[PDB]
Every structure is written in structure tokens, then in C-alpha cells.
Amino acid sequence: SLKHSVTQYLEEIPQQVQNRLYTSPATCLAIYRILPPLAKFFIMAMVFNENEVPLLDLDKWVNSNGKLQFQNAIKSMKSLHLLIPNKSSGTLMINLNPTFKISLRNALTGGEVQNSFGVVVEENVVSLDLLDEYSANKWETILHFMVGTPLAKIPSEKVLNLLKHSKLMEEVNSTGEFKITNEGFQFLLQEINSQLWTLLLQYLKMIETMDLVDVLHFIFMLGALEVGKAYKILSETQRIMLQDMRDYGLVFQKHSIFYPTKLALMLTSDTIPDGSLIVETNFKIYSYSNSPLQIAVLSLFVHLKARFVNMVLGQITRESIRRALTNGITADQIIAYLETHAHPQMRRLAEEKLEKKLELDPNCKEPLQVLPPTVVDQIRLWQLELDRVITYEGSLYSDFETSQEYNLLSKYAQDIGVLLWKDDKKKKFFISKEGNSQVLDFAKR
Amino acid sequence: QERMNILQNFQYNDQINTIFLSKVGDTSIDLPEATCLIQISSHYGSRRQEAQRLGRILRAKRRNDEGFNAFFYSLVSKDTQEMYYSTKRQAFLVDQGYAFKVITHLHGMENIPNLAYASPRERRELLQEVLLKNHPLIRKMY
Ligand SMILES: [Mg+2]
């Protein structure tokens, strides 16, 4: 979903803006890496030759087996308008974007680049002691405040404004508090790479009147930078943007020179476990984690009982599950968290159980469930308990002069999908509040 | 004697495969042949009675043949105080390590030919039946 999410955003941007977005090679070298392998293969072929190549020539390269991949590669390449289709002389000729072409040639052959990758002050700092600490703490603060755990130093209004304005962490003044939502637990369930892209993507949409291309000239360029080194200071919009980026633990500033951090390189490309936990049939939890982030997120749906330096022990209860569900966390996500953070011991025992099942009868292949099924069933049953009472807001229609009229109005409600219940014997039906006005208006006509 | 005769018959008689015990057989009765176990009533929240009752099938003779698993069913009415006692009367077996599995529906239960109280008439009759539950010479003269 990582490359899909970034690519999807880059597709919606109008063509007139994409042409301007390729002026800086730093961005071109980043957009090039996100395309499918076949797309990169063809792009590299066209970059160095100043000619036009018919599409049929590209088709000839692909073998019969990989014909399907040739469809996705060309579609994704055309969506970003990198590849311009020009038809003339009865042939659908294919050419590469001149601005994209020049930028890539400059990047590979070391041509004039207009400081697209930045400069170096040659005043290095210690990466392990400061950069790792600074962004880890800065990224820790935003996630802790996200999870709802109490914390001393709350983040600045910039990210706070972004958090609320996003679907993440719904807030209400009447409630006076902030709580996580369905997408919120999903966000906390995503790897660091996607966890960072969600916030940056939301920031891109939030800004208004600061150019959209400049905010991308910085993020993609920020990937080109290497951790543990200085970069002297650029566009005017990139100054306030740089300070704004400083609140998400991406770039560290002593107070003239800014330093990217581990997360900065974590944006471009990819790259016992801490967080692994054991769940027993007694609805107990023992998490082999020493990190306040993991403990806080566990507290969303776990009743913590005590802690040691090496592990945390708690108990699953109806109160905790109800507390999580009320916030919009689905039971499917909870079991996903438990399964993907399972201890090796659970996996080994589950594998042995599967082996014995297949040993007696190898006909059927039962699914490999790492954690006991009773806990999953109980959690789902508690979700059903929340879903017991069903209520809709709407109106009841009655006292119809004629069966024809009752069927006419009720059938219309069914057609537009606003009918919730009907009874032919009583000539009554109930429709949702959303569709009331449409049904009333149709009744008059 | 009669209960002893019933016990022996249940053990060795192939026709009598099932019996209906009560609180007397809750503990200290050995049936090496019993493998399955059901309970329809219970003595409130006592956790021990559940374990003692389960003990009747924990010594099943064929407890070593490949894949064998004894069974212990607990029929409880939903939305009633029985669930309060059921979740409370199995707190000891959970500590030992046993895990209870929730069965909402028995597959293939509808196609059985005849089921008790399938018609509303019988259900109504049973409802009222259970509801209503609450001179030596003068010797010749007689
Ligand atoms: Mg004994």
C-alpha cells in the first residue's frame, strides 16, 4: 500500500502541475523508483536516446508469460504523464517527457542540478546519540498523544491541528477530550513507512494557498539526503515547511543548518521482536515489550495489571474490549494486532497442532491460528453484544387510501434504498430519516 | 442396588448407551466407559461440581487411541441468570487449563426427523405444565 498510496496521490494531480514537478532531478529520481519494475526498465531505455520509439517495439520485449505486467506498467506510466503518446504517419508513436528526460539525465550523469539534492556544511553530528534520540522522542510524543495516554509535553498546534482535521483522533469540545477511531487503530497498525506517509499525505491536502510542487520538492528531496550529515540552507515556502516538518521528528535543528533523521531516510524506500505477546486461554496477556508506545496502544483494549522492565502482564476483560469498541476499533483489527504481534512460542505450538491435524487426516488443510480460538470468539461475541439493539431514525407511513398508493410509495423507497421495513397487511412502512424528503416529494408528485 | 444395577448395565449393556444421573453421581463414581457428558441443570455458582462432573469422563478407557477426544457439553439458556452461574462455575477448570468453546448453533439440527416440542401446541402445553408446578369379635365389621 506504500507505493500504491504515494502513486495514487501523484495521479490525481493535474497534468499542468506534473510538468512543473519534474524540473528538479531530486524529485525525478524519487518518482522513478516507485514505478513497477517493467516501467523502470522502459524508462531507462528511453532516457538516453533522443528519438521516438513505436509502442509495438516495447511490446516485443515482453515475453508471452509476462504480457499482463506490460498492461499495468504502461497504464501507471501514462497516468503520471511521464510517457507522452504522439500519433502520426499512421503509427501510435511513444515518447518520453522532455523535462523528466533532462532531469534524469542530469541526475545520472552528474550534470548541473541546481542543488536539487542540497549541499553539505561538513559539520557532522552524532547520529546515534542525538538524531535517533531526537526523532524517536519527537515521533514518540505524537503517537503517545494519539493513543490517549497521559503525557507531559503535548505537541504543538501544527500537528495537533493536522491530527484533528484528519479522520485520525476525532475530538469534540462538548466531550472536551480526544479519542482514537477505526482508522486510528489502523494507522497505529501500519509500519513506520506508512505511518509517516499518512501524516505527510494529510499535510499535503491540508495546506491552502505554499505551492503543492514545493512541498513535494522537499519531501522527495528529503529522501535523497543521507542521515548523520549537515545540509546548509532553498525556496521560501520550504522554510516554514521545514520548521513544520520539525514537529513530526523528520528533521533536527540545533536552533542555519538542518539535519535529516532516521525517519527522513525511512520515507524513500523500505528499510525476540519487541512487542511480541502471549495470550492464554485464561484471557491473560504477557507482552515482551519495553516501550511506552506499545504499552499505551495495548491499554486501548487491555486492562493492565502490572509491569516489569522486560515484559508487561495484563488481562483481557469485557470492560476493556467495550472501551475499545466504543472508540470505533473493530474486533477484526484487534485480532490482527494480536496475531501479528504473537510470540514465537504460540506460533510453534500452533504449527504442531496443525501438524497433528494433518498427520491423522491430510485431506483438509486447517488454517494456522496462532492464538486460541476461544478468545477470538469471545471478542466477536462482545461485539455482537454491542450490536444487539438496532435503532434507526425515520418516519412511519400509514393510513393509505389505496393498496396501489402504498405499494407505489414503498416500492419507490426500496428503489432508492431508503426503505427499512414494510408490511403489506397493515399497509405500513418505515423509511430512514435520510430519505424522508425524497419520499415526501415523490408522494406529492 | 437399583442404582448399582443401572450402573453395571450402562457399563456392559450395549443397548443402554446413556443414563441420567443427578447430584448423587457428582463425585466418586467411576465409569471407565463414559466418554461424553452433558448437563442441563446446575447447583448455582459452585465451581467444584463442574470439575467433579467432568471427572466422570476424564478416565475413559479409550483415552489413548489416536485422535480421541472426550466431550463435555453445558446447555445454558441465553439472557437468563444461568449464564451468570455458567461463566462463574467454570472458573476452576480455566485455571487448570481447560477452555470452554461457545456453541451458538448445532449444524444439522433441523433435519433430524422428530424434535421434542417442535409445534407451538406442545410448547404451550409444557409451559402450563411447568408453570402449574407451583373388640375382637367386631373385627368383622371392618
Ligand atoms: Mg476417587
Swiss-Prot record, chain A:
**Example GO biological process:** transcription initiation at RNA polymerase II promoter
GO CC list? nucleotide-excision repair factor 3 complex; transcription factor TFIIH core complex; transcription factor TFIIH holo complex
Location in the cell reads: Nucleus
Segments traversing the membrane: none
The molecular function terms in GO held by this entry are: ATPase activator activity; double-stranded DNA binding
Q: Which family does it belong to?
A: Belongs to the TFB2 family.
| Subunit structure as annotated in this protein's UniProt entry | Component of the 7-subunit TFIIH core complex composed of XPB/SSL2, XPD/RAD3, SSL1, TFB1, TFB2, TFB4 and TFB5, which is active in NER. The core complex associates with the 3-subunit CTD-kinase module TFIIK composed of CCL1, KIN28 and TFB3 to form the 10-subunit holoenzyme (holo-TFIIH) active in transcription. An additionnal subunit, TFB6, plays a role in the dissociation of the SSL2 helicase from TFIIH after transcription initiation. Interacts with TFB5.
- The protein depicted here goes by the name General transcription and DNA repair factor IIH subunit TFB2
Q: Which gene encodes it?
A: TFB2
From Swiss-Prot, chain B:
User: In which compartments does the protein localize?
Assistant: Nucleus
Effect of a null allele: Essential, it cannot be deleted; epistasis studies suggest it is involved in damaged DNA excision repair.
Residue ranges of every copy of the Helicase C-terminal domain listed in the record = 1-110
In-chain residues carrying the UniProt-annotated modification Phosphoserine: 119
Q: What does this protein do?
A: ATP-dependent DNA translocase. Component of the general transcription and DNA repair factor IIH (TFIIH) core complex. When complexed to CDK-activating kinase (CAK), involved in RNA transcription by RNA polymerase II. May have 3'-5' helicase activity alone, the TFIIH core however has no 3'-5' helicase activity. Also involved in transcription-coupled nucleotide excision repair (NER) of damaged DNA. In NER, TFIIH acts by opening DNA around the lesion to allow the excision of the damaged oligonucleotide and its replacement by a new DNA fragment.
Q: Which family does it belong to?
A: Belongs to the helicase family. RAD25/XPB subfamily.
Record's subunit section: Component of the 7-subunit TFIIH core complex composed of XPB/SSL2, XPD/RAD3, SSL1, TFB1, TFB2, TFB4 and TFB5, which is active in NER. The core complex associates with the 3-subunit CTD-kinase module TFIIK composed of CCL1, KIN28 and TFB3 to form the 10-subunit holoenzyme (holo-TFIIH) active in transcription. An additionnal subunit, TFB6, plays a role in the dissociation of the SSL2 helicase from TFIIH after transcription initiation. Interacts directly with TFB6.
Any additional notes?
Answer: Present with 825 molecules/cell in log phase SD medium.
Q: Any idea what this protein is called? A: General transcription and DNA repair factor IIH helicase/translocase subunit XPB/SSL2
* Underlying gene: SSL2
Give the fragment's position in the full-length protein.
634 to 837 of 843
